[PDB]
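Q: Second attempt. The first request was missing the SMILES, so the protein and WZX are both included now.
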Amino acid sequence: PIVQNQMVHQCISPRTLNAWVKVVEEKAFSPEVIPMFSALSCGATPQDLNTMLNTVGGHQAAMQMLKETINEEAAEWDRLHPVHAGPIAPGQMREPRGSDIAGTTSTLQEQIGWMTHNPPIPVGEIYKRWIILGLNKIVRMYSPTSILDIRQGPKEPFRDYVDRFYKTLRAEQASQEVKNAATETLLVQNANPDCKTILKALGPGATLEEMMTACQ
Amino acid sequence: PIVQNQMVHQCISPRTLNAWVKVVEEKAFSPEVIPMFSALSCGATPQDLNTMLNTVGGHQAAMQMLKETINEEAAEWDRLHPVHAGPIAPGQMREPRGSDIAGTTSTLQEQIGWMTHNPPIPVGEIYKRWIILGLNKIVRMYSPTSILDIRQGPKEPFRDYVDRFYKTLRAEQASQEVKNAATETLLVQNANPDCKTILKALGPGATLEEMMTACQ
Amino acid sequence: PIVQNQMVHQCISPRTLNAWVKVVEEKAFSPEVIPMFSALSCGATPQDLNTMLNTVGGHQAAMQMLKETINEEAAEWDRLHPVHAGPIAPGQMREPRGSDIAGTTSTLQEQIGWMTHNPPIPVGEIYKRWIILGLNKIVRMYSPTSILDIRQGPKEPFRDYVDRFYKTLRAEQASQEVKNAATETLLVQNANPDCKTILKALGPGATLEEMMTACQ
Amino acid sequence: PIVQNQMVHQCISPRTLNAWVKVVEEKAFSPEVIPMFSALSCGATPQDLNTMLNTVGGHQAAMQMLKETINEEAAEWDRLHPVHAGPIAPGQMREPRGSDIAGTTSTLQEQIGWMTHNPPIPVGEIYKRWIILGLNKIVRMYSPTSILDIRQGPKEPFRDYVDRFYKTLRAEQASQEVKNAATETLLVQNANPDCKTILKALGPGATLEEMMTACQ
Amino acid sequence: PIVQNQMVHQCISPRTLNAWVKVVEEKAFSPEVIPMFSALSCGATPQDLNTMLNTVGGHQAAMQMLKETINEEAAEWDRLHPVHAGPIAPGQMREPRGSDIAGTTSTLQEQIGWMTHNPPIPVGEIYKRWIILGLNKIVRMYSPTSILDIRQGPKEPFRDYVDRFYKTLRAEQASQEVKNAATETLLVQNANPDCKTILKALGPGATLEEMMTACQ
Amino acid sequence: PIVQNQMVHQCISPRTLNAWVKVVEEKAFSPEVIPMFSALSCGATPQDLNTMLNTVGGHQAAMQMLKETINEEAAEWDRLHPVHAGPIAPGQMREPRGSDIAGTTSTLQEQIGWMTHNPPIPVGEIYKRWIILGLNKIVRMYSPTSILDIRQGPKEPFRDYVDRFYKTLRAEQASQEVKNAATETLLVQNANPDCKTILKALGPGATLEEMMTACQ
Ligand SMILES: CCOC(=O)CN1CC(=O)Nc2ccccc21
Ligand SMILES: CCOC(=O)CN1CC(=O)Nc2ccccc21
Ligand SMILES: CCOC(=O)CN1CC(=O)Nc2ccccc21
Ligand SMILES: CCOC(=O)CN1CC(=O)Nc2ccccc21
Ligand SMILES: CCOC(=O)CN1CC(=O)Nc2ccccc21
Ligand SMILES: CCOC(=O)CN1CC(=O)Nc2ccccc21
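A: Got both inputs this time. The predicted holo structure:
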């Protein structure tokens, strides 16, 4: 990444290379892989981000959809920040284009220069915006199950049911407002009759905690 | 987190990301996960705390009750510390609101600035107060068993019994004063007749050690 | 803990949090857990010591006897070092009471200030004296077996027998003088007749090595 | 490698020695081993690169093809950058030849001097260009399967099929332009009739995501 | 231990605490545990050395023979370096006695002061001389087998035989001169007739390599 | 080893002690253990090198042949660099003899002084030349199989065959010139008739890659 003593380039740690590859091996594209990708790529250059992306042996369909999202993001970047053509002023910083931010056309030096400049041209954090927006499209994609098919078994503890509902809501990339709101509607509707009957009795303004105790 | 050389932002370590995720995988919401959460989040920014929270794939019902506790804590914060509306003085620190402390509306820079200021605006330690108060509500919730149903088997060693009692008392979030006091009452009542008879003989002012030897 | 560059507060390492929790999981309250507790808590604040104590999910009976030992040690502390009541001089160090040393009433800052002062008020090392004196009471308690019931099988190698004897002597918290002395008496008496006969032949002034060769 | 405090030689870490040897043991010459080799050899001297190469017990046929690629690259280097023969000016840097860049004729000191010079003679990064160009020839070689034999089973989920296609395309070292393009042609042709029929309906200008949803 | 930035006290690492305890668990008192003990106790204080010794749950007979060796070494120390009795000059370094070097009567501060002084009073390295001389007495003790009972099976490869011979010679603590010499005598005598006959043919001045090839 | 901040002695890491002992446990004297020994002993003193050597419990026949190689290398050293006899000039560096380089007669201080001097007397790198030349003699020794007995099975993939050939060539310590050359002769001769026939067709000037594709 880029880190502090001044701001200096550091080699991506075997610890970190490993941790990303194991997390993709174990959790595939489970929602919780995104906040963890972000965490393992703290202070990462575009070369670091390609390195983590490029170390994944499997999921080559997911990786390809990702190149697509990144071409589009690189394209939009070039539409909003066109770069001067012809020779760069000797010994001076040239502006980054989309493929420079993605790390396919920039060098580590170039990338270093952009991120360590005052004020910084933050190509690490910009590309990781691109990659993560792409990584979420893959999560919703690989979301196996609809929130409509998440219903409570007759003998299933309410707590186990709510875990599947919200795990599903999370993979289905539902906005926080539908997550705050999901409680008073589908969570109740989708509950079994014994529980459903308890929850209806509470009425509106019941919390998840109040809901989850009522049916424990 | 934020650490010392001056006070400087450091990348949350793969060691730490892993240790929190394994501890939730293994112990779920066993009481002892709280002091360990706190320990793994030493010097943590709100972004670090969201990162650890967001890396948990399971327990999405628990996570949702937690958003609730945090909205309430963010709300109370705004009720006591309202923030000036309109443009911030150029190049100056704006006050944090509830959602700034929770890390949903602040940036790492903003969060850095608050915690590294003299004297510090300690948003790491404030949000971790919020998260932990929420994490305890989940522990009592997921406390399977009442202290009334913790009784000593006829053939069960007193020591094994006291382990379940106090493990239970801990998950049931009983105050230290009921823990000091629990000895002279329920611990004896809930003991088996052979042991109960020994303990009654000791009378009052007997320690747990004296109690636990008497019945070994 | 508190460590050196000046003397500075450092975050308890995931390595260390883990190592203590694994050592309690594996060895429970085997004597050798004490010197290891001490080692893992090198330079530890009272908050670090509570953190290691509080991370133990099991042994809640042992933990409760420990609160007892610590209340008594905190009480004795207050009996010998009473603290001035009323407002602390602005910007000045207030004296620590028993519950300040135990970390239930002090803050990390307060604790930092005490230990980093010239000369230091060493609350880390004082509380760890308290905790360890309590942890030994638990070892003797959870000592399953008397040195009188450690006797050599007819077919058991003398070396295997002496391992059980001294392992037992150690859990039974016998003073070093009874350990130096245990050789010329019970070790011989408790040995089997074939070995006993050899050892008696040596007479007094025989070492453990001479004893252990004689019977190999 | 060579790292920063100035730029200083550091011992290749047991962590790194291990991580390369495990990655060759587990993944052999799967494409994703290349970006990972590169990552584990960050700031590496030619001696570091030989060290990682030389620690591989297996794949001695692959290693031998690699000596070949490196002799050719060393040869081309000498064809373009011939070195002055006879005595080097006392206390001065001599130019590197091909076998100096490969690390068979240079010393660590010599290699250090080249890479730490202003501006640097970057023999670490030059040899790793050589090694990696050789390592890709081995990947295409050890590519078991043609993209023509990657066809979708009647009962095989489209997503599983696209994973094999692009994993294959990657081992077969197809250029990014054939990867962008592979979608509108062979991916469809090679799909099963039920899916093929859906994809044909979309027509041209369909993305992989649109393709992959259409057939989910 | 004591390490450098000046010379400073460092906390014994969980890595090191663990590595010693695992090595005693796995290899017991196999000769090769000594050079490894020494290595794990690099820069160690007497408190560090007691800590590593005290963390061993098993082998309490071995540990007790070790207290004996250390009392004798502490005694000899006091016989050669008697210490002035009565009050130490205020703020000045008092001389170390045997039990001060063993760490039973010294403090970490006292021990720090001795080892960090110019020139150093090297109590770490002196006690580790004591402990290691004691640890070797335990190795010869726990040497199961005589070099006279190490003989080559009729069907046993000479190389396998020489491994047992020299492993035995090592546990039996034979001096290097008997190891240089052991070849021309017992190694041949103890070999089987087919091999013995080959080795006799070589005559004197044959190396182990020449011996070991002759019989491969 | 000896490392940089100046050049300073550092304690051999538990990581490194472990990594060498595991690599001998797993790979015994497979050729690839040599480049790995070298790597784990980066900046190592003679005491570090003895420490790694001395931590190996097994292979005592190999270790003994190694003492032999080192006595010979120490002897040759003394034949070429005889040392002045009688008292060393007070406070001055005495010259190293063979047994000083091997670390049997030198001290860590003495060894430190030699390696940290300007210009350095490089006893770490000299002894590791000795040890490695000895370690290769052991590899050829423990080479089970001749390159003449490495022949391709009728049904064995050419690639699998070439792996055994070159793995064998490597253990048999054949010079690089016989490795470059081994292709046009024995590799073909030793191949099976179906493959042999293909390879003969190529004629001379065929690469291993061309050879290995021809027969895939
Ligand atoms: C504008 C083009 O940008 C890219 O293709 C970025 N990229 C580079 C890479 O090396 N690997 C990679 C892997 C998956 C997704 C995108 C990448
Ligand atoms: C006022 C709103 O605050 C939050 O929702 C805080 N938060 C942010 C997050 O990223 N994850 C998260 C996970 C569980 C619980 C709370 C969070
Ligand atoms: C005077 C009161 O002191 C304490 O109770 C100390 N203490 C604090 C804690 O957090 N945990 C703990 C766990 C076991 C034993 C004592 C503690
Ligand atoms: C011009 C000659 O260069 C080399 O042979 C480079 N080389 C050196 C080495 O030590 N090992 C190695 C292992 C595989 C491939 C090339 C090497
Ligand atoms: C002169 C007395 O010295 C000692 O007993 C040294 N000692 C101290 C200790 O804490 N543990 C220990 C464990 C095994 C062997 C010796 C020790
Ligand atoms: C001239 C004598 O040198 C040596 O014997 C070097 N030596 C020292 C050692 O401690 N162990 C060792 C283990 C295997 C091989 C050589 C050693």
